[PDB]
DNA sequence: TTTTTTTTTTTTTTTTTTTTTTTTTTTTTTTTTTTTTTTTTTTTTTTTT
């Protein structure tokens, strides 16, 4: 859907073709920056898959890019800063390739720490062993199997979706006072949601 | 003692600079030598009383 998306895997990637590499202009006394995965998707979504498995030394580069939005070259004989103003969209197994629901987030996946705090949301996506959702699975698979270009009746379609979600990201919304008040009054909520006697959450707030 | 991540570390090159090596290249004057003149110093056939 979204342009100015890369797609990315855990270990079919490298450093500099994750973030930046530098390369000679053979027309010139010039050096030419050639653009990975985390610049290609400046102001978009770079979509890492199989995020676990995606190397210790190249986690510190996805590290570095969530932190601090930018990426830093000093290679090849050019120093050059450069925009990773990407948001990042994550899919990671569990350690044992299934989610303990009797652990903690930390003691199911094997991301870093500053990784981990670096992700505004974290979806768990639990397989409950349900027939009734085993049932509508099976439906929707087998309809978009049976029915391709039908079966997908999307009440805007994707080009207006673009145009729309474009138009918007221009907008800057401020915050009113009651939204402040309101802010902090449901931040407190959340805090209380961790406290003593009550059931452990997967992470703390 | 079966599985597993940092660690090199030998091998591909590529860069890449600095240094040593490589490659390219007729024209133009001058001068001696020969063969000519040319003024001058003889010198060898002309004649008289």
């Not at 805007?156 to 939204?179: G, N, T, V």
């Amino acid at each position: 859907f979204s342009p100015r998306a890369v797609y990315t895997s855990g270990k079919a990637s490298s450093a500099a073709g994750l973030t930046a590499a530098v390369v000679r202009d053979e027309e010139s006394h010039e050096f030419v920056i050639e653009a990975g995965a985390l610049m290609l998707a400046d102001n978009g979504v770079c979509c890492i898959d199989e995020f676990d498995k995606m190397d210790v030394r190249d986690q510190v580069a996805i590290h570095e890019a969530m932190e601090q939005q930018t990426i830093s070259i000093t290679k090849a004989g050019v120093k050059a800063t450069l925009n990773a103003r990407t948001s990042i969209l994550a899919a990671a197994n569990p350690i044992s390739g299934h989610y303990d629901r009797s652990k903690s987030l930390k003691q199911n996946i094997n991301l870093s720490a500053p990784i981990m705090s670096r992700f505004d949301l974290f979806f768990i996506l639990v397989d409950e062993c349900n027939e009734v959702t085993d049932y509508a699975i099976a439906r929707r698979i087998v309809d978009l199997h049976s029915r391709i270009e039908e079966s997908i009746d999307r009440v805007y379609s994707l080009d207006d979706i673009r145009r729309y979600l474009l138009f918007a990201r221009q907008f800057k919304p401020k915050i009113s006072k009651e939204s402040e008040d309101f802010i902090v009054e449901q931040y407190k909520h959340l805090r209380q949601r961790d406290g003593s006697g009550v059931t452990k959450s997967s992470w703390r707030i």
